[PDB]
Amino acid sequence: VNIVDYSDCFEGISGGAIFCNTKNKEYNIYNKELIETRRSPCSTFKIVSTLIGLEKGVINSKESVMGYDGTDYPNKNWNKNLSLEEAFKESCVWYYKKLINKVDAKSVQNILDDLKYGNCDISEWEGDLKNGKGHLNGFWLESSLQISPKEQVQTMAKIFEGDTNFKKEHINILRDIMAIDVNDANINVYGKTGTGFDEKNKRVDAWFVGMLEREGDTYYFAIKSDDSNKEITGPKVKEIAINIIKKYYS
Ligand SMILES: *C(=O)N1C[C@H](NOS(=O)(=O)O)CC[C@H]1C(N)=O
């Protein structure tokens, strides 16, 4: 366990980072207090909800559809019968809400327990209804479910090292749709952003969680901001993450 200083890459934004290589068990941690603090995963939960949907047969491939019903949305790309691959990359909330609402709560509880997914608290299934957004809500979006950056990395490692019961075929679908283009062919980067605002503490929950492959070595990582500036989003934290990878993990 090395405590490290990635602060230059955060360019003044409050946050932390953790990178873990399970072959030689080197944990690199920036801002240990934050890295151990549980927070809502927001859209990073789509990593796990994709696997849940595949395991239960709600979806079957990166092509699979959820039966778009014509509802109007402001994001152009949500207004179509999009595939799993597209819904993941667009972070399409209606697709993943429809997916998860086809699965019984006990099945979800037992999967989260098996993954040690933070507090595994799905008690507020419908999510943070006080924000007014109705069905565009769920337990994983600033609601009952909370996970620390360290636990995210531990979960990613268990999934992608083959240490869960999820089918290898399903793991590989998730790998395919998480792949990121970082304009450097010598590293393979995979991940998912997440964006929320913690109304109680007036801080963002801005995430980028995933994995890095670089010549035999694999690092599992989680980068997280808790800044008070509402302009700090998951996509912004992904840029920070990419800068860290390029500076320190190349
Ligand atoms: C997930 O966090 N959400 C869905 C969507 N994706 O955000 S991302 O660009 O950080 O991946 C928008 C924000 C958020 C939500 N409000 O539901």
Number of domains: 1
Count of individual beta strands? 7
Alpha-carbon distance between the two ends? 20 Å
Can you tell me the CATH architecture?
3-Layer(aba) Sandwich
* Fraction of residues in β-strands: 15-25%
> What molecules are bound to this protein?
(2S,5R)-1-formyl-5-[(sulfooxy)amino]piperidine-2-carboxamide
Q: How many H/I helices? A: 9
| CATH homologous superfamily label | DD-peptidase/beta-lactamase superfamily
Biggest sheet layout:
7 strands, mixed
CATH class: Alpha Beta
- Give the class from helix and strand content and strand pairing: alpha+beta
Give a quick set of tags describing it.
about 250 residues, alpha+beta, binds (2S,5R)-1-formyl-5-[(sulfooxy)amino]piperidine-2-carboxamide, 7 strands, 9 helices, hydrolase/inhibitor, Gram-positive, Beta-lactamase, seven-stranded mixed beta sheet
Helices, strands, pairings?
Elements: E1 2-3, H1 7-10, E2 15-21, E3 26-30, H2 32-35, H3 46-56, H4 84-90, H5 93-100, H6 105-115, H7 149-160, H8 168-178, E4 179-180, E5 188-198, E6 203-214, E7 217-225, H9 234-248
Parallel strand pairs: 1-3
Antiparallel strand pairs: 2-3, 2-7, 4-5, 5-6, 6-7
Helix pairs in contact: 3-8
The protein binds (2S,5R)-1-formyl-5-[(sulfooxy)amino]piperidine-2-carboxamide (NXL).
(2S,5R)-1-formyl-5-[(sulfooxy)amino]piperidine-2-carboxamide binds at residues 42-43, 91, 93, 141, 193-196, 233-235.
PDB class: hydrolase/inhibitor
Keywords: Gram-positive, beta-lactamase, antibiotic resistance, inhibitor, avibactam, hydrolase, HYDROLASE-INHIBITOR complex
Assembly: monomeric
